[PDB]
Symmetry: C2
Subunit: 250 residues, 2 copies
């Protein structure tokens, strides 16, 4: 409709929010989808997608995505005709719900798609779609909001993680130890065949002295300072290759 806020559609209460604009990130996307049989069809979906807004819910073990792009019926029917394990039903008002074992897809109007995937406790498509009329009001950090505004402007990938601890122990790999850590923000922008990133992490009760700061600053090859209880990492880089390898683990 007139004013669809994509974050209002994915829903409030998520453990992780994602903003992923396609422009400027094609080569990263390419790296991620070199490892799938459906790479020809995904590529075509990417060519028709401007940005993806995502939310992960740990409690119901689900991901909800809102895709802003161009998805005319001829195109989606073409992709659908070429897919294994997908079924479709037309609702009361002519909208097609595509259903898979763990995935639901609808195209409620030609400029957007709503995707829900995960466990059997994932949200009903119909409930997500009601948020087109009555959107949720999630609370997002200022730079996350900035990247999401005026779709087409930003080429920065943005992540907001409610619990930074969980995310540190999975990535760095000590999936047993517990860290009392607050919210994490992460922003990634392409530059050559690498990504510039900025990270901020609320420390809570956890204390990080100069010895620890210095070592992380070497493990990451980036500038570190602590503003109160907020750890900030600026001017760091990661290879598009390295970055591609990390996302594929999920």
């Amino acid at each position: 409709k007139a004013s669809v806020d994509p974050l209002g559609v994915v829903g409030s209460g998520a453990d992780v929010y994602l903003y992923f604009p396609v422009a400027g990130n094609e080569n990263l996307i390419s790296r991620i989808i070199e490892n799938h049989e459906s790479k020809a069809d995904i590529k075509k979906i990417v060519d028709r997608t401007t940005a993806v807004y995502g939310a992960f819910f740990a409690r119901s073990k689900e991901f909800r995505l809102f895709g802003s792009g161009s998805y005319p019926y001829a195109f989606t029917n073409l992709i659908f005709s070429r897919s294994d394990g997908w079924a479709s039903t037309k609702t009361e008002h002519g909208i097609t719900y595509y259903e898979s074992e763990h995935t639901d897809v609808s195209i409620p109007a030609p400029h957007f798609s709503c995707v829900i995937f995960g466990s059997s406790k994932r949200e009903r498509m119909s409930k997500m779609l009601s948020r087109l009329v009555n959107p949720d009001r999630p609370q997002l950090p200022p730079r996350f909001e900035k990247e999401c505004t005026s779709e087409g402007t930003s080429q920065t990938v943005a992540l907001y993680i409610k619990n930074g601890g969980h995310f540190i122990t999975k990535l760095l790999n000590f999936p047993q130890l517990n860290l009392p850590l607050g919210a994490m923000e992460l922003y990634l922008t392409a530059r050559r065949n690498e990504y510039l990133y900025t990270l901020s992490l609320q420390l809570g009760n956890a204390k990080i002295n100069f010895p620890i700061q210095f070592l992380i600053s070497r493990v990451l090859n980036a500038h570190i300072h602590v503003e109160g209880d907020r750890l900030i990492i600026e001017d760091g880089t990661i290879s598009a290759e390295r970055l591609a390898s990390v996302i594929s683990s999920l």
Copy 2:
């Protein structure tokens, strides 16, 4: 003579001891001497050298080396004839002392050379040479002694550093802070275009918990444990290129 102990000749009391066998390390040597005009002559000296024993003395700002190899008069005279800034004098007993601004070289018998370089307070050649008859008795760690025994056996570069702290602050680059650290041992063995290394460091009063151990283990990509007050780093690697870059800083 019959029993010349090269470590007895470089002298006791040094801050750093080095054992550097040429065989198995030619490609590293090559990397180090790509950056000198005299590279043709050094290469020829290397082709005639089996091992180098070295000692650095901080107080007198000097390095003393004993080179085991083959240095017949025709060869040394050839190198000498081709050099700028070198002078020579034949002593009472026919031995040639080569003298430079900061460097003294003698070949007391055809299978070894003694080299002294550094400040104006560096040792007189004549005093070093007296240790061919009356050697010093330096105390060296067991694996250092092992590498030095039966010249030709080992291809491992060995370092014994009396004060590990000094060495950590120069390399890792925080040349202002002080660490109360004991002795360091370091052993390097070639393997492909990289070097396998083992390091042990006496900690003294310094304390290193699991958070610190883990991070260093990532900064170095190696296995770390602490046996009492001794930090041990095993199975670590460094590129022959990286290693070459570090030595050239001196």
